[PDB]
Every structure is written in C-alpha cells, then in structure tokens.
Write a protein that binds this ligand. Structure first.
Ligand code: HEM
Ligand SMILES: CCCCCCCCOCCOCCOCCOCCOCCOCCO
Length: 460
C-alpha cells in the first residue's frame, strides 16, 4: 500500500538513514533512489514525502481535498493543540480560514496596502537617521513585518524603539530559532520520551505562553473599549462574531481559537517575510547590477517623489521577477509545512492511510531543472520572457499550493514589493564585504541566511 522507502527500525524509524549534508540533502538522496514519492519513518510515524513539481501539484492541486489536512509540529503543538487557523483541521480550520480570509480582505478603516506603505515610510524615516552607518537589518525587518500583523490584529503599529515591542520581538524571534534548531527536530521524532526532560521545547513553550498572555490582555482591552458599529481590527471583528454565535454551542468562534488564531498570524506572518527581505538585500549586495536595474525601473515607472503603490508592480516586471527569484532561491520553507491526508487516499501506485503525514518538499519544485535554467544561481530571467514581460512558472510555489496555500500570500507579496521598492527608491546600498566574497549559503530545518552588515546611502 504505502509508497516505497528505507526499511524502518522499531521506535527509531529511519533515524540512521541520514543525514550528512542535511535533512534536505537526505531527502534529495532518498529521492534519487526511491523516486519522487517515498515513505520515511520519523520515529514510529510514517511520512509520505512529495518531491518535484509534478508530484506536489498532483497531490495538493489535483486532489486538493484529500491533501488538505494539517500535521502537528511537536515543539509548538502543546501551545496550539489543534486550535488556530494554521493547526486546525476539518470544520474548525474551514471556519477560521473562511473568517480570517474574509476579514483581512478588508483590513479596520485604512487598507492593508495603506498600512504597508505607512510602515515603509516609517522604515525610510528610520533608516535615514543612521546617515549611512553600518547596521544589521534583522531587527528592523522583523519589526516592519510584525508591525503589519500588529496593525491588522491590534489596529495599531509600534514604534521601532518601544521596549514592549522590542521585548515581544526578541521573544518571538528566539522561538523561531529554537523551533528550527536540530534539538527541536530531535524532539519531533521522540517527543514522547523527551517531553519529560529539559530542552528547547520548554523554552519555546514559555516564550509562546508569554506572547499568548499579551494577546489575552489585548483581547480584554479590546472588549472593554469595543464599539460594535466601528470594528478596529481582527480582534474586534472576531469579538463581534463571538457575540453573534453566542447561542450556537457548535461554534468554533470561542476564546481559545481567538488567542491562537492571532498567535498563528504572528507565527506565519513575520519570520518568513522578514527573512525574505533580509535574504533579498543580501542578494542585492552580491549583484549590484540587478539592484541597479531595479532602481532604473523604479525611476522610470514611479519616479523619485511619490511612494510606490501596489498598482506599480504590474508595470514593473523586472522588479517583480527579481522578487520572484529572491523567493525561489531563498527557499525559506524547503520542506513546506506538514500536511496529512483527510481520508484513505489513492495516490499514484499507493494508498496513503487516513491521517498519514505528508511533507510537500517545496524546495525540489523551486529548484526543478525543468522550469529553471539555472536552479542554483540567481537568475531573474527565470521569470522574464523574450519581450521582458513577467512570465508564470510552474515550479514557483514558495507559498505552497491547494487549499492550504498561504493564507497571507497577497499580504506577503505586497510587503515584499512595497518594502523592496520603497527602500531602493530612497537608498542605495553598500557593505564591507566585496560582492564576490559574499556567501549566500545558509546556516537546521530552517534555511536561514547568514548575518551581515549593510549601509543605506540616501539618494538625490
Ligand atoms: C514571504 C512570506 C511568506 C511565505 C513564503 C509563506 C509561505 C507559506 C507556506 C509555504 C505555507 C504552508 C501552506 C501549506 O500548508 O502547504 C504557509 C501557510 C500559512 N501562511 Fe504563509 N507565508 C508567508 C507569509 C505569510 C503572511 C504575511 C501571512 C499572514 C499575514 C501568512 C499566513 C499563513 C497562514 C495563516 C498559513 C496556514 C494556512 C492554513 O493552514 O490554512 N503567511 N505560508
Ligand atoms: C542523526 C540524527 C538525525 C535527526 C534528524 C531529525 C529529522 C527530523 O526532521 C524533520 C523535521 O520536520 C521538517 C518539517 O518541519 C517544517 C516546520 O516548519 C515550521 C514553519 O513554521 C512557520 C509556519 O509559517 C511559515 C509560513 O507562514
């Protein structure tokens, strides 16, 4: 029934069938023997691995409903516990997703785009203060993407030097490092034993509990100040839907799903976006001619006075292609987020029993040599046709595909476009390291780029 793969040991599974270069290189090596679809054992748990564009498309698109289940991540499950939009399943997920999708479509008063532009203006104002001083951009890029989520859920942004904000930021971004760490990957395989002993899991738990506590306080603060005729944000809207469903005891719109849906938005909405911006500017230091062409396109379509608007992207295929290529080569979620099959499901030769975990290895699509001339080399041409127009690419699935496709895709892409262009419109860039010496190779389950310094040199 199950797809082929290495014979598992009891308890340990295919632990010893790796890892060498890494978990990605193992899967790549495993793939080269067993094919594009294979079974691997994480401890005693069987997982089906989907490799290559065709197989991932065939599962997530052509059988969308079967492959619409969400798998657990062991280090954060004790916080989420199947609540919230990311880790919910079945009807719960369906309802939270529908509500969330519909809600963020409107904001609040001012739109998400307008908030991103404002954030972009705040960023520029801030960068301008350094006067070309060296800086690591990690914090500011974590801040700007968190502020967009804060704007959406709390109806406001925080100042960049606010200690309340900075403390939460530090809390958040320690958690991501720990979640991705090798120790948490060991915890994934053997949580049942390891949950009784000290480890990264305890620290992840406390960090996320602190964040949840802050969110709970905001919720109470929102309720206490609520104008039901004028919702300010996601929480107000959710609070109003809570009231409407007050009678229905089969309603998913209760307190627990509120707290953890908000946590979910921060969990999925900050790290990947920030790192994408950080990785992007690393590439822009390594390839100044690209950066130069982007600025020329900014100057031609937008000019030097008004700020970029999302409308501009349609007229800026080169920049848009650069952003596509940044996301592709960046490959920030190489294994995807874990799925499960919602029923005994027929896939190629095989039957995947109900609730079996499935990893869609986005990386193998993003590096698919069918769709990309130069998979391992930065090449904006990958997304440009012979007329210099943006071209769609079947391999390009950084946000995944199907019913679980990134709920924030449009928000993510808008941030990417407006931040990159608003920054480059106002600043050129430099750093101590010669372009030729800049190393793009990442630092376990994460694909995190190395730290670096950059200058933002005001223009005009
Ligand atoms: C460059 C930035 C981002 C990238 C590359 C990205 C990518 C992804 C990927 C690969 C998934 C897994 C989908 C699956 O299960 O197959 C996902 C899920 C998700 N993302 Fe994003 N994301 C980004 C930013 C955001 C933002 C800004 C938001 C919200 C504003 C967001 C919200 C979510 C949510 C809620 C899910 C869970 C969807 C569900 O289970 O229904 N993400 N994202
Ligand atoms: C020799 C010892 C080897 C130990 C090897 C352990 C292997 C275990 O590795 C498998 C780990 O699971 C890989 C899939 O995890 C993906 C988790 O991604 C977390 C991303 O969370 C943020 C979600 O939002 C991102 C998009 O918005």
């Amino acid at each position: 029934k199950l797809p082929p793969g290495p014979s598992p040991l009891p308890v340990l599974g295919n632990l010893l069938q790796m890892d060498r270069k890494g978990l990605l290189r193992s899967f790549l090596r495993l793939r080269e023997k067993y094919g594009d679809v294979f079974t691997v054992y994480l401890g005693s748990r069987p997982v089906v691995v989907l490799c290559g564009t065709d197989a991932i498309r065939e599962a997530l698109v052509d059988q969308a409903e079967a492959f619409s289940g969400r798998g657990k991540i062991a280090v954060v499950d004790p916080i989420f516990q199947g609540y919230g939009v990311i880790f919910a399943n079945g009807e719960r997920w369906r309802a939270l997703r529908r509500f969330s999708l519909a809600t963020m479509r409107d904001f609040g008063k001012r739109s998400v785009e307008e908030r991103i532009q404002e954030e972009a203006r705040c960023l520029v104002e801030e960068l301008r203060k350094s006067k070309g001083a060296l800086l690591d951009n990690t914090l500011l890029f974590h801040s700007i993407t968190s502020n967009i989520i804060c704007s959406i859920v709390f109806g406001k942004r925080f100042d960049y030097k606010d200690p309340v904000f900075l403390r939460l930021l530090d809390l958040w971004f320690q958690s991501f490092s720990l979640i991705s760490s090798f120790s948490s990957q060991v915890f994934e395989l053997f949580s049942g034993f390891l949950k009784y002993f000290p480890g990264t899991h305890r620290q992840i738990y406390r960090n996320l509990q602190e964040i949840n506590t802050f969110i709970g306080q905001s919720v109470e603060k929102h309720r206490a100040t609520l104008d039901p005729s004028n919702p300010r944000d996601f929480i107000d809207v959710y609070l109003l839907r809570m009231e409407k469903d007050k009678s229905d005891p089969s309603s998913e719109f209760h307190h627990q799903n509120l707290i953890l849906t908000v946590l979910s938005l921060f969990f999925a909405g900050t790290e990947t976006t920030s790192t994408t911006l950080r990785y992007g500017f690393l590439l822009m230091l390594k390839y100044p001619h690209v950066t130069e062409r982007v600025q020329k396109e900014i100057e031609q379509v937008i000019g030097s006075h008004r700020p970029p608007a999302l409308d501009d992207r349609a007229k800026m295929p080169y920049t848009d292609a650069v952003i596509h290529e940044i996301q592709r080569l960046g490959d920030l979620i190489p294994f995807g987020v874990p799925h499960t099959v919602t029923k005994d499901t027929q896939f190629r030769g095989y039957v995947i029993p109900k609730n079996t975990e499935v990893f869609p290895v986005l990386s193998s699509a993003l590096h698919d040599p069918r769709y990309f001339e130069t998979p391992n080399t930065f090449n904006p041409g990958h997304f440009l046709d012979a007329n210099g127009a943006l071209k769609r690419n079947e391999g390009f699935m950084p946000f995944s595909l199907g019913k679980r496709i990134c709920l924030g895709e449009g928000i993510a892409r808008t941030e990417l476009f407006l931040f990159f262009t608003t920054i480059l419109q106002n600043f050129s860039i430099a750093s101590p390291v010669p372009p030729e010496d800049i190393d793009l190779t990442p630092r376990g389950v994460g694909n995190v780029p190395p730290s670096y310094q950059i200058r933002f040199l005001a223009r005009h």
